[PDB]
Amino acid sequence: GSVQASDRLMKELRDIYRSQSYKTGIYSVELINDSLYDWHVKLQKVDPDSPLHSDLQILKEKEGIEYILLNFSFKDNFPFDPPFVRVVLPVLSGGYVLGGGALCMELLTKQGWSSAYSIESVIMQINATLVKGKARVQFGANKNQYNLARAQQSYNSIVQIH
Numbered sequence: 001g002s003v004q005a006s007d008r009l010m011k012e013l014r015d016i017y018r019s020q021s022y023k024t025g026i027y028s029v030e031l032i033n034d035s036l037y038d039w040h041v042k043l044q045k046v047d048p049d050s051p052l053h054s055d056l057q058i059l060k061e062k063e064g065i066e067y068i069l070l071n072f073s074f075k076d077n078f079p080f081d082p083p084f085v086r087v088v089l090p091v092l093s094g095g096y097v098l099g100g101g102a103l104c105m106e107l108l109t110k111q112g113w114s115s116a117y118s119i120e121s122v123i124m125q126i127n128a129t130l131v132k133g134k135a136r137v138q139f140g141a142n143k144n145q146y147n148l149a150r151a152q153q154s155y156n157s158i159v160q161i162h
Contacts, residue, residue: 043126052134083122086151087101092136094135095133098155
């Protein structure tokens with residue numbers, strides 16, 4: 001990585017760990033492999049009135065899982081380039097989620113990303129936008145259709161037409 005990226009990523013984590021949204025358990029953050037550049041982020045409280053909330057209760061009954069697990073991956077040039085954010089599980093339809101689990105949200109593109117955004121704000125926006133876009137769980141869905149490679153391929157396809 002880089003000193004600039006790492007400095008910023010540590011500041012983001014620190015801000016998250018002191019934030020109210022984190023304190024009240026809306027979402028969780030953990031590093032993967034102790035890498036500042038790779039994070040588990042679980043969306044744990046989605047709009048309780050949404051069908052997504054209802055679907056996650058069914059999933060909890062089925063699989064013990066009542067959350068959406070996201071993966072955030074950062075590059076050397078962060079915060080000038082956005083994090084790459086993708087869904088790990090469960091498989092979703094709608095909600096601005098693409099094949100492979102990429103997210104098609106303007107804040108995450110080169111057009112919409114600003115270093116003015118905290119990572120806390122990014123996590124909360126994603127939560128709101130899944131609900132706004134009517135995300136639903138795909139219950140019959142092939143496990144392992146989501147991974148970095150396939151998410152990158154979808155995101156690359158969008159840049160060609162966006």
